[PDB]
């Protein structure tokens, strides 16, 4: 079946791929939390003159 | 013959070496930081007029104008702000599903059981919004859009396919194909160079656009996956399933990372949405909440009530002040 | 997008007239309608508005009681009934579509405008009344709101027309920054409350004219003088 | 307070309201039904008994009563990620074949296709979705189903039948077995029809089904019931 | 009805 | 008689505070928890609202019987008696209204798609509140204050011929607020209980069966209470009306019993069209 050797050739390119440690990539997702940490309003909640749905 | 077993030692080599990448946990990682606290947000607009059950929602990029698909046939446009309705779209086919608003806030697409997606002008020189489009190829209900640039549109569908259009021809100028169940929803990365999508195969895939094929292929999930969402960084995607479980993949570490579960929440997950910094994963659920969850932690911030039904869909703006849920209450509610 | 007039002549005074302008091309129900007239040798003056579905209508003072404004939908009509004609009715009147929504462009469309003979709170000024310009060079315009424009929401309401000699006048800048589709990027508009500025770059042929600024933040719907452009 | 372009966007949002309520108060008046069935059920006769590449929508009128039936017969994929779609409507009809008990499905597969249709009938009926929702259920091709049960006898679709070979007799046992499929009892009601390709009744059955639908939802909507 | 009346 | 007075000032004040209790707890229910979103929500809460108007007028009358006088005025006295002649319609149409909307509902459903709405329920019950004005305010304006043996009378009086308005008005009463409800809602409950007889999911198994003998027994009940509450008292005023009868104990106690009976219709409506049905019900088992 032709099927069978798409998905092997596909599991070919898929396992030929780079992969950083997951302690890099959780130190990244972590440094990008920080880094923005202070432009987020839901997080930090803003005062009701910079809340364009005040009432 | 011999290809399944080939097929199955790649994939134990696959497992082996995502194994030996798992060097540490994020969970463990993270324990130096501090919790983010009780996140506690109010009602702040109640958008009301569909009548109808509520399946899709999408912000504009202006973070004021959204768009709101029903199943009475009907698409409104809606001024955040003042409440007001800018537009209500009657469709063709009243069985809609997905809803999409263009960058440029000039088009709106929607598509539904019909396996027709739909494009709406809004600056039209009538003075009304005209269908500009209907791309036709699909044999399956369309379950997700998403507008690439004003002339480029990913759809997915429920014939197991994903398909890169181009409006003006009106024809699939790229088709994804591998998922083996319905591809239920598709997250656009920041970039727009790739894009992610998750099947009722339990799985995700990442898909190159421009090549066409899959990059990487993530698993993890013991039931359908309903709804998917690209971190604000562009480096990990939250999935948001049937099993009552979310998880975060990383796409580099080629791995799942964290998963988002507690004991007393049973129901299968809707839609879920980051903040603008991420730290925040907000996920509709069908006991009819939102529970808003630190991303980087697992433990649930804030609770999100307030819908009499299913919270449907959610989105965050783009620059992050509110969030609006809609659901089968024929509600949408913006959260602050 | 057409609409155009009929209903002009002369008219002895105390006489009635019924100004009719028919529209085609575009959804005439979902769009408000004005009546704007035009002196034989002064500016624009707004005269009259009804709004979709009819549901407001609005005159100016010094035609209050006169004139009848209605529209017809079914058959996409504007009317205006006009009784005791005046010596100083005699105008060029225009009728204007204009719809209402968050990023619209009101005013944006311009009707042919009849002609009809009669024989017997907020001010804005132009500065200049003629400026003698060449092809190449900037061009800037300023007008002067005696009441801030700046409303509270964040918008200045100041529109920016030219009349091209012997046509309607056009929409150029709509809410004193956004540039009216179809106009070139040469035109922008600039300024702040009481006090703005039209800038025309690398002026052409096809700029000449007369140019208005006009208010929205009200209903005198007041004009401008009229800066009018030579070579 | 608001600016004069404000007041104006806000009439136009109360004139889109006007239409929103226009357009739901004329849909509320509509009764919807959805058309269930295997491939050759008679579908495609109900349809065109009725009216004189996804959903189909055929509308129809009968008796002042407007009626949106949906043939959802296209859709190959998984029936659990779109059922939920049609919760609120008012009836449902399963069109089946009476003269299949006997024929096997297409792929040869060994499997009757009676007994398709019957576990199709199980999964519609007992579906979270539908638990109040009134079935009507088609019984379609009696007077074939008459030509092959004189021949052969309907011990091939139910070998514990117990019963004669009459049309009649082997008509109730079939109607009989798919009504017992129905769990809740109490809440659910099941209209069984005969109809091969002439009748022209179908109709009023339909409209007489729906009416004590209505009756119903009326009666629980006045505290009645 | 009927006391004052 | 001190025991005389005892049982009747105890009859009036026991009516007035189990009406104002249950017609306040319904409205108070239905304005938190059900709202008004149905036709139903809105004829309960408008039945509600007039019981509790018309029995909030039971002190001032007790009181009138034990002082043997009206120590409250002119103005007091028109108000109290155009508040008890209008309530008492408002209740009685309202009641005809729901028993319309119910025969509607069950034996015309197309047509009930099209009336049946919140919109013509709220135009329903402006017509009502409108027509019952039609005798508020005759009374409102016939209403005076009149000395009798050094005691002031809050009684009516009228124009001129022997009485002829008395009587008129007598009439009027019996005949558009007992004999022309009886007819609407007999009628209509009769009408609608032979059709729900054929109704199909009514019929059949023990459990529908079981359902159709309770809908049939709550119609009979709901007719029956009119009926009992309200037949006595308009019969004595005719005897009254057309024969006269000693003033004896006896005399006294059923006057006062049948006013209180007259009155006990606005304190069993609650339950019978609020308290017990499946919507409320359920409210209430879900808290
Ligand atoms: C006036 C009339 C044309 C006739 C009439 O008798 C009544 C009317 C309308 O309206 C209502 C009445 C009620 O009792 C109930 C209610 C308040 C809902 C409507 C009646 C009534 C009598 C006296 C007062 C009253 C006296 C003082 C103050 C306030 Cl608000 C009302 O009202
Ligand atoms: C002309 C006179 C007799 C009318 C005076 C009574 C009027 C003002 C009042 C008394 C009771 C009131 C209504 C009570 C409750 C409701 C339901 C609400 O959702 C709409 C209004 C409605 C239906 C009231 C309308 C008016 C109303 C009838
Ligand atoms: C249908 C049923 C519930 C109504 C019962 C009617 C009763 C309550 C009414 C109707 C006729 C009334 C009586 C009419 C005349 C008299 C004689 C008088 O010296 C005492 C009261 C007495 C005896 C009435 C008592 C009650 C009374 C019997």
């Not at chain 3, 002549?9 to 959804?27: E, M």
């Amino acid at each position: 079946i032709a099927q069978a050797r798409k998905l092997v050739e596909q599991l070919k390119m898929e396992a030929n791929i780079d992969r950083i440690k997951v302690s890099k990539a959780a130190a990244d997702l972590m440094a990008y939390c920080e880094a923005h940490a202070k432009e987020d309003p839901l997080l930090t909640p803003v005062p009701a003159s910079e809340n364009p749905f005040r009432e | 013959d011999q290809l399944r077993q080939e097929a199955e030692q790649l994939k134990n080599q696959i497992r082996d070496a995502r194994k030996a990448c798992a060097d540490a946990t994020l969970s463990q990682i993270t324990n130096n930081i501090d919790p983010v606290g009780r996140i506690q947000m109010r009602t702040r607009r109640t958008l009301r007029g569909h009548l109808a059950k509520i399946y899709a929602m999408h912000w504009g990029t202006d973070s004021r104008l959204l768009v709101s698909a029903s199943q009475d046939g009907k698409l409104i446009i809606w001024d955040s702000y003042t409440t007001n309705k800018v537009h209500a779209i009657p469709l063709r086919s009243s069985w809609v599903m997905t809803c999409a608003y263009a960058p440029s806030g000039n088009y709106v697409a929607c598509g539904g059981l019909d396996n027709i997606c739909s494009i709406y002008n809004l600056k039209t020189r009538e003075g009304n919004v005209r269908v500009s489009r209907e791309l036709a190829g699909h044999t399956g209900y369309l379950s997700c859009c998403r507008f690439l640039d004003d002339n480029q549109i990913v759809t997915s569908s429920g014939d197991t396919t994903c398909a890169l259009w181009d409006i003006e021809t009106g024809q699939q100028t790229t088709t994804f194909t591998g998922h083996t169940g319905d591809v239920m929803s598709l997250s656009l990365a920041p970039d727009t160079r790739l894009f992610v999508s998750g099947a009722c195969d339990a799985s995700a895939k990442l898909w190159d656009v421009r090549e066409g094929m899959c990059r990487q292929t993530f698993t993890g999930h013991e039931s359908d996956i309903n709804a998917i969402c690209f971190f604000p960084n562009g480096n990990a995607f939250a999935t948001g399933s049937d099993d009552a479980t979310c998880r975060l993949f990383d796409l580099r570490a080629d791995q799942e990372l964290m998963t988002y579960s507690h004991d007393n929440i049973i129901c299968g997950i809707t839609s879920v949405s980051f903040s603008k910094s991420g730290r925040l994963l907000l996920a509709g659920y069908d006991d009819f909440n939102c529970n808003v969850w630190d991303a980087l932690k697992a433990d649930r911030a804030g609770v999100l009530a307030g819908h009499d039904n299913r919270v449907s869909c959610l989105g965050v703006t783009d620059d992050g002040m509110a969030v609006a849920t809609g659901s089968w209450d024929s509600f949408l509610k913006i959260w602050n | 997008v057409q609409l155009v007039e009929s209903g002009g002549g002369l008219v002895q005074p105390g006489g009635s007239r019924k100004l009719s302008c028919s529209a085609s091309g575009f959804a005439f129900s979902s769009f408000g309608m004005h009546w704007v007239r035009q002196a034989p040798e002064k500016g624009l003056e707004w005269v009259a508005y009804i709004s979709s579905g009819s549901g407001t209508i609005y005159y100016a003072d010094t035609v209050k009681g006169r004139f009848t404004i209605s529209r017809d939908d079914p058959k996409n009509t504007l009317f205006l009934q006009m009784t005791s004609l005046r010596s100083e009715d005699t105008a060029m009147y225009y009728c204007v579509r204009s719809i209402y929504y968050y990023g619209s462009s009101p005013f944006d469309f311009w009707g042919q405008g009849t002609t009809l003979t009669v024989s017997a709170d907020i001010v804005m000024t132009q500065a200049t009344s003629s400026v003698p310009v060449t092809p190449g060079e900037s061009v800037s315009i300023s007008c002067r709101s005696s009441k801030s424009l700046l409303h509270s929401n964040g918008n200045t309401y100041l529109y920016w027309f030219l009349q091209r000699p012997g046509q309607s006048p056009q929409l150029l800048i709509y809410r004193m920054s956004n540039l009216a589709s179809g106009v070139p990027d040469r035109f922008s508009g600039s300024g702040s409350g009481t006090a703005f500025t039209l800038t025309i770059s690398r002026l052409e042929a096809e700029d000449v004219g007369v140019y208005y600024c006009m208010q929205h933040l009200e209903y005198p719907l007041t004009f401008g003088a009229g800066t009018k452009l030579e070579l | 307070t608001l600016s004069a372009e404000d007041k104006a966007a806000v009439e136009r949002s109360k004139m889109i309201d006007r239409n929103l309520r226009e357009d739901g108060e004329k849909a509320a008046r509509e009764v919807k039904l959805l058309l269930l069935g295997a491939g050759e059920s008679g579908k495609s006769t109900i349809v065109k008994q009725m009216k004189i590449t996804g959903i189909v929508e055929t509308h129809f009128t009968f008796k002042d009563l407007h009626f949106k039936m949906f043939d959802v017969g296209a859709q190959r994929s998984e029936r659990k990620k779109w059922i939920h779609c049609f919760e609120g409507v008012t009836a449902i009809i399963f069109c089946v074949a009476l003269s299949d008990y006997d024929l096997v499905l297409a792929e040869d597969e060994e499997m009757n296709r009676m007994h398709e249709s019957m576990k199709l009938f199980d999964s519609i009926c007992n579906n979270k979705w539908f638990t109040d929702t009134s079935i009507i259920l088609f019984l379609n091709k009696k007077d074939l189903f008459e030509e092959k049960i004189k021949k052969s006898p309907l011990t091939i679709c139910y070998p514990e039948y117990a019963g004669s070979n009459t049309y009649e007799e082997a008509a109730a046992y079939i109607q009989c077995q798919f009504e017992d499929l129905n769990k809740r009892k109490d809440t659910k009601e099941i209209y069984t029809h005969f109809t091969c390709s002439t009748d022209t009744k179908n109709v009023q059955f339909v409209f007489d089904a729906v009416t004590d639908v209505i009756i119903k939802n009326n009666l629980k909507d006045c505290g009645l019931f | 009805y009927x006391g004052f009346x | 008689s001190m025991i005389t007075a005892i049982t009747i000032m105890a009859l009036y004040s026991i009516v007035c505070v189990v009406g104002l209790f249950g017609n306040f707890l319904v409205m108070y229910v239905i304005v938190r928890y059900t709202k008004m979103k149905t036709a139903t929500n809105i004829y309960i809460f408008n039945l509600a609202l007039a019981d509790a108007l018309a029995t909030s007028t039971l002190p001032f009358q007790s009181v009138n019987y034990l002082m043997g006088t009206w120590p409250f005025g002119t103005i007091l006295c028109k108000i109290v008696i155009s508040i008890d002649y209008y309530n008492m319609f408002t209740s009685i149409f309202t009641l005809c209204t729901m028993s319309v909307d119910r025969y509607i509902a069950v034996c015309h459903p197309v047509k009930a798609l099209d009336f049946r709405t919140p919109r013509n329920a709220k135009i329903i019950n402006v017509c009502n509140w409108i027509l019952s004005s039609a005798i508020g305010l005759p009374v409102m304006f016939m209403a005076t204050t009149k000395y009798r043996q050094g005691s002031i009378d809050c009684t009516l009086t009228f124009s001129h011929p022997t009485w002829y308005w008395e009587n008129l008005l007598k009439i009027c009463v019996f005949i558009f607020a007992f004999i022309m409800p009886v007819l609407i809602i007999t009628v209509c409950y009769g009408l609608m209980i032979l059709r729900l007889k054929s109704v199909r999911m009514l019929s059949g198994s023990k459990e529908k069966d079981r359902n159709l003998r309770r809908i049939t027994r709550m119609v009979l009940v709901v007719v029956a209470v009119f009926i009992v509450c309200w037949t006595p008292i308009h019969i004595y005023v005719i005897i009254k009306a057309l024969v006269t009868i000693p003033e004896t104990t006896f005399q006294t106690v059923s006057w006062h019993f049948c006013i209180a009976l007259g009155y006990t219709n606005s304190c069993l409506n609650p339950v019978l069209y609020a308290f017990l049905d499946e919507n409320f019900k359920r409210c209430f088992r879900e808290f």
